[PDB]
Amino acid sequence: MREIVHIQAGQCGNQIGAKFWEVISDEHGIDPTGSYHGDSDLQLERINVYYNEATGNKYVPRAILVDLEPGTMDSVRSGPFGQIFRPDNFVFGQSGAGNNWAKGHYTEGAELVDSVLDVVRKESESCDCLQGFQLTHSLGGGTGSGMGTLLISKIREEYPDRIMNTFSVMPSPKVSDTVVEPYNATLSVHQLVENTDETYCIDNEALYDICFRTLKLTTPTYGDLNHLVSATMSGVTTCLRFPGQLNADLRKLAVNMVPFPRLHFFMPGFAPLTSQYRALTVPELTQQMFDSKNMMAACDPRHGRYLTVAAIFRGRMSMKEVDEQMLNVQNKNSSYFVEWIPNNVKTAVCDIPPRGLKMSATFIGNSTAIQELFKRISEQFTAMFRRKAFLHWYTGEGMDEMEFTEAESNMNDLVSEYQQYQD
Amino acid sequence: KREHEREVIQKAIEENNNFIKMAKEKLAQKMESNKENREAHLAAMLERLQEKDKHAEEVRKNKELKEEA
Numbered sequence: 263m264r265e266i267v268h269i270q271a272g273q274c275g276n277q278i279g280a281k282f283w284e285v286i287s288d289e290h291g292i293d294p295t296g297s298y299h300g301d302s303d304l305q306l307e308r309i310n311v312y313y314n315e316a317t318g319n320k321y322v323p324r325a326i327l328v329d330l331e332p333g334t335m336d337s338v339r340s341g342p343f344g345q346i347f348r349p350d351n352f353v354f355g356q357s358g359a360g361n362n363w364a365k366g367h368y369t370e371g372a373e374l375v376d377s378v379l380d381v382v383r384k385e386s387e388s389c390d391c392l393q394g395f396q397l398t399h400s401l402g403g404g405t406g407s408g409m410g411t412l413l414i415s416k417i418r419e420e421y422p423d424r425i426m427n428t429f430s431v432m433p434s435p436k437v438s439d440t441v442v443e444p445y446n447a448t449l450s451v452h453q454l455v456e457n458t459d460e461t462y463c464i465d466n467e468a469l470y471d472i473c474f475r476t477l478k479l480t481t482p483t484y485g486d487l488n489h490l491v492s493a494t495m496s497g498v499t500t501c502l503r504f505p506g507q508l509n510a511d512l513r514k515l516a517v518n519m520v521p522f523p524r525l526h527f528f529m530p531g532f533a534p535l536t537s538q539y540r541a542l543t544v545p546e547l548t549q550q551m552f553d554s555k556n557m558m559a560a561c562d563p564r565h566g567r568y569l570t571v572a573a574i575f576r577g578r579m580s581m582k583e584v585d586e587q588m589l590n591v592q593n594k595n596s597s598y599f600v601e602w603i604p605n606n607v608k609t610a611v612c613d614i615p616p617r618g619l620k621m622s623a624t625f626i627g628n629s630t631a632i633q634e635l636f637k638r639i640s641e642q643f644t645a646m647f648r649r650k651a652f653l654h655w656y657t658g659e660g661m662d663e664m665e666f667t668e669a670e671s672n673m674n675d676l677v678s679e680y681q682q683y684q685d
Numbered sequence: 686k687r688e689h690e691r692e693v694i695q696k697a698i699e700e701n702n703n704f705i706k707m708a709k710e711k712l713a714q715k716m717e718s719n720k721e722n723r724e725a726h727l728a729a730m731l732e733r734l735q736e737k738d739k740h741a742e743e744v745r746k747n748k749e750l751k752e753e754a
């Protein structure tokens with residue numbers, strides 16, 4: 263049994279995490295009470311990866327809900343699948359992080375981090391073979407950004423030989439809460455570079471554009487954006503949650519997707535983009551999958567090169583045709599794949615499709631074009647930091663200007679590292 | 686990294702405690718300086734008035750000197 267411990271921190275991390283558990287509980291036939299009511303035994307072959315079996319054939323998610331405010335977690339407990347989580351796994355504070363990285367990471371989250379690790383330890387001790395942890399959070403706030411990275415750093419100290427995986431939501435001025443989001447994002451990115459094995463870069467700018475340009479939504483809400491995240495998270499965990507001839511685990515993904523330890527930020531993609539009765543052919547799935555308009559990272563793949571690519575097709579389809587279309591993409595646009603990593607595109611097919619779709623495809627790409635995302639964050643960071651604007655919110659929590667300068671340098675170094683492998 | 690985390694939260698406490706200390710000392714200085722100043726002005730006013738009484742007790746002293754002559 264290769265179990266995964268799920269952690270969700272902050273408002274964004276819990277709302278996105280709650281939707282993720284709502285989606286995959288439906289896929290595994292788990293009702294909000296926690297009882298299995300499915301048909302196929304394939305829904306329970308690897309149910310232990312994300313669920314713990316309780317007395318009376320009850321399935322409880324191996325999830326830990328963390329926040330410095332009680333508001334969002336009260337919504338989750340009152341949500342559709344709120345009754346499925348362990349009451350013990352609700353670890354929350356009262357003051358909040360105030361959209362401040364320092365409060366999450368240094369002052370307010372420090373008071374709460376130890377109690378979270380006790381729940382992490384309680385879940386890890388009851389695992390036959392713990393393969394790692396996955397964290398859902400945003401980088402532009404204070405709790406998921408500040409405390410989440412603090413949790414990652416402390417979890418690595420206690421579990422150094424386990425895989426750290428994150429679903430990290432990048433801030434964007436298009437969908438913005440505070441002007442200090444570039445500060446929080448730049449501080450978090452430096453943490454993610456050193457302490458995570460795989461990070462799915464979910465850009466709120468990309469999610470907004472997909473809802474606006476593609477799905478034709480004039481005023482997208484966070485629910486609309488989180489619908490795209492749920493589809494992506496379900497897709498990128500399909501190989502973990504469903505049986506296949508690949509025996510997929512987190513470590514194997516990291517070994518094959520990450521050729522250099524710091525370049526572990528993946529571009530997720532999904533097809534078809536949904537917000538609907540016509541079936542999608544395999545050539546259509548492959549074309550949309552590599553299309554920039556289906557990318558969740560707001561980067562143009564044609565502006566860089568793919569180091570490694572992992573693709574997941576879901577539904578009853580011709581595996582012969584899937585290999586035809588995947589090879590067609592590589593042989594056509596071979597200039598967008600590195601020629602010094604042979605066979606850097608992996609394809610897996612799962613017979614069980616997501617809810618409401620006959621055919622779907624999920625894209626996981628380690629493209630050097632992701633530097634555009636870090637360039638965008640860096641430019642927004644520098645424009646404020648050159649004038650030391652809003653810095654008092656952080657120096658009042660004990661931080662120093664030097665820490666921001668180091669984070670800025672690490673951010674620009676990461677762009678330099680992604681740039682050298684583009685030639 | 687753990688050492689840096691302790692130093693940041695200790696620096697935050699030190700600067701908040703220093704802010705409370707600086708305000709308490711500044712206010713104590715101002716209230717003490719104000720009390721000394723206002724008392725010094727009232728003392729000066731009473732000094733002039735008590736000097737006037739000395740001049741009044743002296744003007745009467747001159748009339749008693751000349752009425753008996």
Ligand SMILES: Nc1nc2c(ncn2[C@@H]2O[C@H](COP(=O)(O)OP(=O)(O)O)[C@@H](O)[C@H]2O)c(=O)[nH]1
Binds near residue numbers: 278359403439466485
């Ligand atoms: N996609 C998505 N992004 C969110 C959501 N809630 C907040 N955000 C983003 O996250 C940032 C705010 O962080 P937040 O989660 O509120 O901070 P925290 O609660 O202190 O950890 C902003 O850049 C928002 O755009 C959500 O439900 N979905």
Ligand SMILES: COc1cc(S(=O)(=O)Oc2ccc3[nH]c(C)cc3c2)cc(OC)c1OC
Binds near residue numbers: 497515519
């Ligand atoms: C947990 O997520 C996944 C894990 C795996 S894996 O365990 O077989 O790792 C590998 C093995 C060989 C590889 N070659 C390349 C270029 C990438 C790669 C990854 C495959 C996936 O889909 C293809 C996954 O996506 C859901």
Ligand SMILES: [Ca+2]
Binds near residue numbers: 373
């Ligand atoms: Ca406190």
Ligand SMILES: [Mg+2]
Binds near residue numbers: 273
């Ligand atoms: Mg918020």
